[PDB]
Amino acid sequence: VNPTVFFDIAVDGEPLGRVSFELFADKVPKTAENFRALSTGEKGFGYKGSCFHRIIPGFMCQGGDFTRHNGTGGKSIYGEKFEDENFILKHTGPGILSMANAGPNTNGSQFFICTAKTEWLDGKHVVFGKVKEGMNIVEAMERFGSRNGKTSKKITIADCGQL
């Protein structure tokens, strides 16, 4: 019953592979729905064609800024921002999908895929999914990152949608 969405990842335009995510709509329905809808593009905007603009190996990959491509943009399907839905789920290890934000109740479209346990984020970022298939592809993406987060090649979501 929880939805599954996929990203097909490209590196400098060359296909890398597919990552799929389970979205925890049972626990965080509003947050899950935002990500789902941005992944299908059904509202007229979304993730297709957008980049990962900050990848720090041993920490996380961050994406979802489809308006400014650098961490300063994005918007949700509910408006510019929306509230922190709950903090039921924790950052338990690699593969966790969590919302980026700029303070309390400022969730937009940006998210990060953890590649480490990041327990210091618990109660401050809303966890709403996990990698289901293709964690190996996330690990491959991580190799293009750097300590300061700049990527050495352009990592894009070449296609995305619901499975």
Side-chain angles (χ1 to χ4, degrees):
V1 124
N2 277 340
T4 300
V5 294
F6 74 89
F7 289 174
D8 285 333
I9 305 294
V11 178
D12 279 350
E14 294 306 305
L16 178 65
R18 177 172 284 191
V19 184
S20 72
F21 308 97
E22 177 180 356
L23 308 178
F24 295 126
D26 63 327
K27 301 286 188 299
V28 276
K30 184 170 181 170
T31 312
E33 175 63 8
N34 180 58
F35 191 92
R36 189 200 65 76
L38 292 171
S39 292
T40 65
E42 64 198 64
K43 302 295 187 188
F45 51 97
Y47 294 135
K48 188 180 178 181
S50 68
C51 78
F52 291 84
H53 69 271
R54 190 168 188 255
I55 298 180
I56 299 167
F59 175 25
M60 57 103 172
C61 310
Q62 182 173 339
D65 181 357
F66 53 81
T67 68
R68 302 186 61 73
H69 327 293
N70 68 4
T72 66
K75 60 181 187 179
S76 88
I77 67 170
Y78 310 116
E80 183 168 312
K81 301 163 193 183
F82 74 102
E83 71 273 17
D84 294 314
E85 180 171 13
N86 64 58
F87 299 104
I88 290 171
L89 302 173
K90 293 182 184 301
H91 297 81
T92 53
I96 290 290
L97 181 64
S98 185
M99 290 303 289
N101 68 52
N105 307 303
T106 64
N107 297 294
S109 48
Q110 290 185 69
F111 55 84
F112 60 102
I113 306 169
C114 297
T115 56
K117 176 177 186 175
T118 58
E119 69 276 7
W120 62 90
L121 302 175
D122 296 342
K124 170 168 64 168
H125 295 266
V126 178
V127 172
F128 67 95
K130 68 174 186 179
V131 174
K132 180 182 188 198
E133 314 173 290
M135 192 63 203
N136 56 298
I137 300 306
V138 173
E139 296 172 322
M141 293 167 47
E142 200 178 18
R143 296 187 210 118
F144 293 96
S146 65
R147 288 291 305 277
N148 67 20
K150 185 181 180 70
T151 60
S152 65
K153 290 179 176 177
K154 192 66 160 183
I155 310 299
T156 57
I157 302 168
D159 202 8
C160 51
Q162 189 165 357
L163 293 176

PDB file of all heavy atoms in Angstrom, residues 39-66:
ATOM      1  N   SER A  39       7.607  13.565  -7.871  1.00  0.00           N
ATOM      2  CA  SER A  39       8.269  12.526  -8.664  1.00  0.00           C
ATOM      3  C   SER A  39       7.485  12.114  -9.908  1.00  0.00           C
ATOM      4  O   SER A  39       8.079  11.643 -10.872  1.00  0.00           O
ATOM      5  CB  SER A  39       8.545  11.279  -7.816  1.00  0.00           C
ATOM      6  OG  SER A  39       9.524  11.543  -6.815  1.00  0.00           O
ATOM      7  N   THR A  40       6.163  12.248  -9.886  1.00  0.00           N
ATOM      8  CA  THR A  40       5.379  11.958 -11.095  1.00  0.00           C
ATOM      9  C   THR A  40       5.211  13.196 -11.975  1.00  0.00           C
ATOM     10  O   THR A  40       4.917  13.081 -13.166  1.00  0.00           O
ATOM     11  CB  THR A  40       3.977  11.449 -10.779  1.00  0.00           C
ATOM     12  OG1 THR A  40       3.271  12.498 -10.131  1.00  0.00           O
ATOM     13  CG2 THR A  40       4.001  10.198  -9.907  1.00  0.00           C
ATOM     14  N   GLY A  41       5.379  14.372 -11.377  1.00  0.00           N
ATOM     15  CA  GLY A  41       5.198  15.643 -12.058  1.00  0.00           C
ATOM     16  C   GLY A  41       3.753  16.010 -12.302  1.00  0.00           C
ATOM     17  O   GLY A  41       3.474  16.952 -13.042  1.00  0.00           O
ATOM     18  N   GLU A  42       2.832  15.285 -11.678  1.00  0.00           N
ATOM     19  CA  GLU A  42       1.417  15.429 -12.014  1.00  0.00           C
ATOM     20  C   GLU A  42       0.838  16.817 -11.743  1.00  0.00           C
ATOM     21  O   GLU A  42      -0.156  17.202 -12.375  1.00  0.00           O
ATOM     22  CB  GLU A  42       0.580  14.347 -11.333  1.00  0.00           C
ATOM     23  CG  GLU A  42       0.566  14.399  -9.827  1.00  0.00           C
ATOM     24  CD  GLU A  42       0.092  13.089  -9.228  1.00  0.00           C
ATOM     25  OE1 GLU A  42       0.789  12.063  -9.410  1.00  0.00           O
ATOM     26  OE2 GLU A  42      -0.986  13.081  -8.596  1.00  0.00           O
ATOM     27  N   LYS A  43       1.461  17.576 -10.845  1.00  0.00           N
ATOM     28  CA  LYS A  43       0.977  18.928 -10.526  1.00  0.00           C
ATOM     29  C   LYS A  43       1.542  19.964 -11.497  1.00  0.00           C
ATOM     30  O   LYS A  43       1.203  21.139 -11.402  1.00  0.00           O
ATOM     31  CB  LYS A  43       1.352  19.340  -9.100  1.00  0.00           C
ATOM     32  CG  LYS A  43       0.847  18.425  -8.003  1.00  0.00           C
ATOM     33  CD  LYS A  43      -0.654  18.423  -7.926  1.00  0.00           C
ATOM     34  CE  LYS A  43      -1.150  17.635  -6.729  1.00  0.00           C
ATOM     35  NZ  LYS A  43      -2.645  17.479  -6.770  1.00  0.00           N
ATOM     36  N   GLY A  44       2.414  19.542 -12.411  1.00  0.00           N
ATOM     37  CA  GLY A  44       2.961  20.440 -13.420  1.00  0.00           C
ATOM     38  C   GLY A  44       4.382  20.903 -13.185  1.00  0.00           C
ATOM     39  O   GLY A  44       4.953  21.659 -13.987  1.00  0.00           O
ATOM     40  N   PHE A  45       4.962  20.425 -12.091  1.00  0.00           N
ATOM     41  CA  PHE A  45       6.332  20.719 -11.743  1.00  0.00           C
ATOM     42  C   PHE A  45       6.866  19.545 -10.931  1.00  0.00           C
ATOM     43  O   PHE A  45       6.092  18.720 -10.430  1.00  0.00           O
ATOM     44  CB  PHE A  45       6.422  22.019 -10.943  1.00  0.00           C
ATOM     45  CG  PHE A  45       5.491  22.089  -9.765  1.00  0.00           C
ATOM     46  CD1 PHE A  45       5.935  21.766  -8.496  1.00  0.00           C
ATOM     47  CD2 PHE A  45       4.178  22.517  -9.925  1.00  0.00           C
ATOM     48  CE1 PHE A  45       5.079  21.839  -7.414  1.00  0.00           C
ATOM     49  CE2 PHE A  45       3.321  22.602  -8.851  1.00  0.00           C
ATOM     50  CZ  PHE A  45       3.766  22.267  -7.594  1.00  0.00           C
ATOM     51  N   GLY A  46       8.182  19.446 -10.812  1.00  0.00           N
ATOM     52  CA  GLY A  46       8.750  18.371 -10.032  1.00  0.00           C
ATOM     53  C   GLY A  46      10.197  18.086 -10.306  1.00  0.00           C
ATOM     54  O   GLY A  46      10.926  18.925 -10.831  1.00  0.00           O
ATOM     55  N   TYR A  47      10.594  16.867  -9.973  1.00  0.00           N
ATOM     56  CA  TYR A  47      12.001  16.522  -9.909  1.00  0.00           C
ATOM     57  C   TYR A  47      12.648  16.192 -11.231  1.00  0.00           C
ATOM     58  O   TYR A  47      13.862  16.236 -11.338  1.00  0.00           O
ATOM     59  CB  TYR A  47      12.205  15.340  -8.969  1.00  0.00           C
ATOM     60  CG  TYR A  47      11.894  15.602  -7.502  1.00  0.00           C
ATOM     61  CD1 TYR A  47      11.167  14.688  -6.771  1.00  0.00           C
ATOM     62  CD2 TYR A  47      12.352  16.737  -6.852  1.00  0.00           C
ATOM     63  CE1 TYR A  47      10.918  14.886  -5.442  1.00  0.00           C
ATOM     64  CE2 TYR A  47      12.086  16.950  -5.525  1.00  0.00           C
ATOM     65  CZ  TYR A  47      11.371  16.026  -4.822  1.00  0.00           C
ATOM     66  OH  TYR A  47      11.099  16.209  -3.482  1.00  0.00           O
ATOM     67  N   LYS A  48      11.873  15.813 -12.232  1.00  0.00           N
ATOM     68  CA  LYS A  48      12.504  15.374 -13.475  1.00  0.00           C
ATOM     69  C   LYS A  48      13.435  16.437 -14.051  1.00  0.00           C
ATOM     70  O   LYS A  48      13.043  17.601 -14.221  1.00  0.00           O
ATOM     71  CB  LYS A  48      11.454  14.993 -14.509  1.00  0.00           C
ATOM     72  CG  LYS A  48      12.047  14.342 -15.735  1.00  0.00           C
ATOM     73  CD  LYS A  48      10.979  13.962 -16.772  1.00  0.00           C
ATOM     74  CE  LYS A  48      11.603  13.356 -18.023  1.00  0.00           C
ATOM     75  NZ  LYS A  48      10.580  13.010 -19.054  1.00  0.00           N
ATOM     76  N   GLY A  49      14.670  16.031 -14.331  1.00  0.00           N
ATOM     77  CA  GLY A  49      15.663  16.928 -14.892  1.00  0.00           C
ATOM     78  C   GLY A  49      16.504  17.698 -13.889  1.00  0.00           C
ATOM     79  O   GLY A  49      17.453  18.392 -14.277  1.00  0.00           O
ATOM     80  N   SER A  50      16.168  17.596 -12.607  1.00  0.00           N
ATOM     81  CA  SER A  50      16.870  18.356 -11.573  1.00  0.00           C
ATOM     82  C   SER A  50      18.111  17.598 -11.114  1.00  0.00           C
ATOM     83  O   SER A  50      18.277  16.415 -11.388  1.00  0.00           O
ATOM     84  CB  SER A  50      15.947  18.680 -10.388  1.00  0.00           C
ATOM     85  OG  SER A  50      15.590  17.525  -9.651  1.00  0.00           O
ATOM     86  N   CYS A  51      18.994  18.304 -10.428  1.00  0.00           N
ATOM     87  CA  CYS A  51      20.282  17.754 -10.035  1.00  0.00           C
ATOM     88  C   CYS A  51      20.410  17.498  -8.540  1.00  0.00           C
ATOM     89  O   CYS A  51      19.645  18.008  -7.737  1.00  0.00           O
ATOM     90  CB  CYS A  51      21.403  18.675 -10.483  1.00  0.00           C
ATOM     91  SG  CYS A  51      21.685  20.132  -9.508  1.00  0.00           S
ATOM     92  N   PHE A  52      21.393  16.683  -8.196  1.00  0.00           N
ATOM     93  CA  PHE A  52      21.917  16.637  -6.847  1.00  0.00           C
ATOM     94  C   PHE A  52      23.044  17.645  -6.787  1.00  0.00           C
ATOM     95  O   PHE A  52      24.047  17.522  -7.501  1.00  0.00           O
ATOM     96  CB  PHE A  52      22.398  15.230  -6.505  1.00  0.00           C
ATOM     97  CG  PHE A  52      21.279  14.230  -6.381  1.00  0.00           C
ATOM     98  CD1 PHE A  52      20.762  13.603  -7.502  1.00  0.00           C
ATOM     99  CD2 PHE A  52      20.740  13.934  -5.146  1.00  0.00           C
ATOM    100  CE1 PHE A  52      19.735  12.701  -7.374  1.00  0.00           C
ATOM    101  CE2 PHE A  52      19.709  13.050  -5.018  1.00  0.00           C
ATOM    102  CZ  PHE A  52      19.208  12.428  -6.116  1.00  0.00           C
ATOM    103  N   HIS A  53      22.873  18.650  -5.936  1.00  0.00           N
ATOM    104  CA  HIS A  53      23.803  19.768  -5.899  1.00  0.00           C
ATOM    105  C   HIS A  53      24.754  19.723  -4.705  1.00  0.00           C
ATOM    106  O   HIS A  53      25.634  20.576  -4.586  1.00  0.00           O
ATOM    107  CB  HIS A  53      23.030  21.077  -5.894  1.00  0.00           C
ATOM    108  CG  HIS A  53      22.278  21.315  -4.630  1.00  0.00           C
ATOM    109  ND1 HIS A  53      20.989  20.869  -4.442  1.00  0.00           N
ATOM    110  CD2 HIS A  53      22.649  21.907  -3.470  1.00  0.00           C
ATOM    111  CE1 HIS A  53      20.587  21.204  -3.229  1.00  0.00           C
ATOM    112  NE2 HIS A  53      21.577  21.831  -2.619  1.00  0.00           N
ATOM    113  N   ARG A  54      24.575  18.747  -3.816  1.00  0.00           N
ATOM    114  CA  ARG A  54      25.448  18.620  -2.651  1.00  0.00           C
ATOM    115  C   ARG A  54      25.567  17.157  -2.228  1.00  0.00           C
ATOM    116  O   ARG A  54      24.609  16.571  -1.726  1.00  0.00           O
ATOM    117  CB  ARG A  54      24.929  19.480  -1.489  1.00  0.00           C
ATOM    118  CG  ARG A  54      25.894  19.610  -0.310  1.00  0.00           C
ATOM    119  CD  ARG A  54      25.442  20.712   0.675  1.00  0.00           C
ATOM    120  NE  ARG A  54      26.437  20.996   1.717  1.00  0.00           N
ATOM    121  CZ  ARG A  54      26.357  20.612   2.992  1.00  0.00           C
ATOM    122  NH1 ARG A  54      25.313  19.925   3.437  1.00  0.00           N
ATOM    123  NH2 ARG A  54      27.334  20.929   3.833  1.00  0.00           N
ATOM    124  N   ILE A  55      26.745  16.581  -2.451  1.00  0.00           N
ATOM    125  CA  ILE A  55      27.010  15.182  -2.119  1.00  0.00           C
ATOM    126  C   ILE A  55      28.261  15.142  -1.265  1.00  0.00           C
ATOM    127  O   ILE A  55      29.336  15.557  -1.706  1.00  0.00           O
ATOM    128  CB  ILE A  55      27.195  14.294  -3.363  1.00  0.00           C
ATOM    129  CG1 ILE A  55      25.921  14.297  -4.193  1.00  0.00           C
ATOM    130  CG2 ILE A  55      27.569  12.896  -2.940  1.00  0.00           C
ATOM    131  CD1 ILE A  55      25.990  13.456  -5.447  1.00  0.00           C
ATOM    132  N   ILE A  56      28.106  14.677  -0.033  1.00  0.00           N
ATOM    133  CA  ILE A  56      29.220  14.573   0.918  1.00  0.00           C
ATOM    134  C   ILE A  56      29.381  13.098   1.238  1.00  0.00           C
ATOM    135  O   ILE A  56      28.524  12.507   1.895  1.00  0.00           O
ATOM    136  CB  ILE A  56      28.987  15.393   2.198  1.00  0.00           C
ATOM    137  CG1 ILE A  56      28.841  16.869   1.851  1.00  0.00           C
ATOM    138  CG2 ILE A  56      30.162  15.185   3.166  1.00  0.00           C
ATOM    139  CD1 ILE A  56      28.313  17.700   2.954  1.00  0.00           C
ATOM    140  N   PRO A  57      30.468  12.479   0.746  1.00  0.00           N
ATOM    141  CA  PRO A  57      30.627  11.053   1.010  1.00  0.00           C
ATOM    142  C   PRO A  57      30.699  10.762   2.490  1.00  0.00           C
ATOM    143  O   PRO A  57      31.301  11.509   3.272  1.00  0.00           O
ATOM    144  CB  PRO A  57      31.955  10.715   0.326  1.00  0.00           C
ATOM    145  CG  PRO A  57      32.086  11.723  -0.755  1.00  0.00           C
ATOM    146  CD  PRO A  57      31.520  12.982  -0.156  1.00  0.00           C
ATOM    147  N   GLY A  58      30.060   9.669   2.881  1.00  0.00           N
ATOM    148  CA  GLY A  58      30.002   9.303   4.288  1.00  0.00           C
ATOM    149  C   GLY A  58      28.988  10.110   5.086  1.00  0.00           C
ATOM    150  O   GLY A  58      28.985  10.069   6.305  1.00  0.00           O
ATOM    151  N   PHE A  59      28.147  10.872   4.405  1.00  0.00           N
ATOM    152  CA  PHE A  59      27.122  11.644   5.086  1.00  0.00           C
ATOM    153  C   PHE A  59      25.822  11.583   4.282  1.00  0.00           C
ATOM    154  O   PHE A  59      24.876  10.914   4.691  1.00  0.00           O
ATOM    155  CB  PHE A  59      27.635  13.069   5.319  1.00  0.00           C
ATOM    156  CG  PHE A  59      26.617  14.012   5.918  1.00  0.00           C
ATOM    157  CD1 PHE A  59      25.561  13.551   6.666  1.00  0.00           C
ATOM    158  CD2 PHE A  59      26.748  15.382   5.757  1.00  0.00           C
ATOM    159  CE1 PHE A  59      24.649  14.432   7.223  1.00  0.00           C
ATOM    160  CE2 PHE A  59      25.834  16.256   6.312  1.00  0.00           C
ATOM    161  CZ  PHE A  59      24.790  15.777   7.052  1.00  0.00           C
ATOM    162  N   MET A  60      25.745  12.277   3.153  1.00  0.00           N
ATOM    163  CA  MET A  60      24.479  12.318   2.431  1.00  0.00           C
ATOM    164  C   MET A  60      24.551  12.912   1.039  1.00  0.00           C
ATOM    165  O   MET A  60      25.476  13.668   0.707  1.00  0.00           O
ATOM    166  CB  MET A  60      23.446  13.101   3.250  1.00  0.00           C
ATOM    167  CG  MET A  60      23.862  14.513   3.603  1.00  0.00           C
ATOM    168  SD  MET A  60      23.060  15.743   2.585  1.00  0.00           S
ATOM    169  CE  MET A  60      23.560  17.265   3.376  1.00  0.00           C
ATOM    170  N   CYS A  61      23.550  12.555   0.240  1.00  0.00           N
ATOM    171  CA  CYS A  61      23.310  13.189  -1.052  1.00  0.00           C
ATOM    172  C   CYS A  61      22.075  14.054  -0.919  1.00  0.00           C
ATOM    173  O   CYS A  61      21.066  13.582  -0.403  1.00  0.00           O
ATOM    174  CB  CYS A  61      23.005  12.137  -2.120  1.00  0.00           C
ATOM    175  SG  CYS A  61      24.180  10.778  -2.216  1.00  0.00           S
ATOM    176  N   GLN A  62      22.150  15.304  -1.370  1.00  0.00           N
ATOM    177  CA  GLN A  62      21.036  16.225  -1.276  1.00  0.00           C
ATOM    178  C   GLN A  62      20.624  16.724  -2.659  1.00  0.00           C
ATOM    179  O   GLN A  62      21.462  17.158  -3.461  1.00  0.00           O
ATOM    180  CB  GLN A  62      21.375  17.403  -0.371  1.00  0.00           C
ATOM    181  CG  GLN A  62      20.206  18.370  -0.194  1.00  0.00           C
ATOM    182  CD  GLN A  62      20.474  19.445   0.828  1.00  0.00           C
ATOM    183  OE1 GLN A  62      21.338  19.307   1.701  1.00  0.00           O
ATOM    184  NE2 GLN A  62      19.726  20.542   0.725  1.00  0.00           N
ATOM    185  N   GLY A  63      19.315  16.696  -2.892  1.00  0.00           N
ATOM    186  CA  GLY A  63      18.742  17.168  -4.130  1.00  0.00           C
ATOM    187  C   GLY A  63      17.402  17.820  -3.909  1.00  0.00           C
ATOM    188  O   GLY A  63      17.050  18.202  -2.783  1.00  0.00           O
ATOM    189  N   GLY A  64      16.676  17.971  -5.009  1.00  0.00           N
ATOM    190  CA  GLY A  64      15.318  18.471  -4.975  1.00  0.00           C
ATOM    191  C   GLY A  64      15.124  19.946  -5.224  1.00  0.00           C
ATOM    192  O   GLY A  64      13.992  20.410  -5.209  1.00  0.00           O
ATOM    193  N   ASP A  65      16.194  20.685  -5.474  1.00  0.00           N
ATOM    194  CA  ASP A  65      16.051  22.093  -5.794  1.00  0.00           C
ATOM    195  C   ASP A  65      15.880  22.233  -7.287  1.00  0.00           C
ATOM    196  O   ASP A  65      16.836  22.484  -8.020  1.00  0.00           O
ATOM    197  CB  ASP A  65      17.239  22.913  -5.316  1.00  0.00           C
ATOM    198  CG  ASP A  65      17.092  24.388  -5.617  1.00  0.00           C
ATOM    199  OD1 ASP A  65      16.087  24.775  -6.258  1.00  0.00           O
ATOM    200  OD2 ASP A  65      18.012  25.146  -5.255  1.00  0.00           O
ATOM    201  N   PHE A  66      14.644  22.103  -7.736  1.00  0.00           N
ATOM    202  CA  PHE A  66      14.370  22.139  -9.163  1.00  0.00           C
ATOM    203  C   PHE A  66      14.221  23.554  -9.719  1.00  0.00           C
ATOM    204  O   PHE A  66      14.124  23.718 -10.932  1.00  0.00           O
ATOM    205  CB  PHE A  66      13.160  21.258  -9.516  1.00  0.00           C
ATOM    206  CG  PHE A  66      11.918  21.557  -8.722  1.00  0.00           C
ATOM    207  CD1 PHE A  66      11.088  22.608  -9.068  1.00  0.00           C
ATOM    208  CD2 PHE A  66      11.568  20.770  -7.640  1.00  0.00           C
ATOM    209  CE1 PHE A  66       9.939  22.878  -8.342  1.00  0.00           C
ATOM    210  CE2 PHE A  66      10.426  21.038  -6.914  1.00  0.00           C
ATOM    211  CZ  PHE A  66       9.611  22.092  -7.263  1.00  0.00           C
TER     212      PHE A  66
END
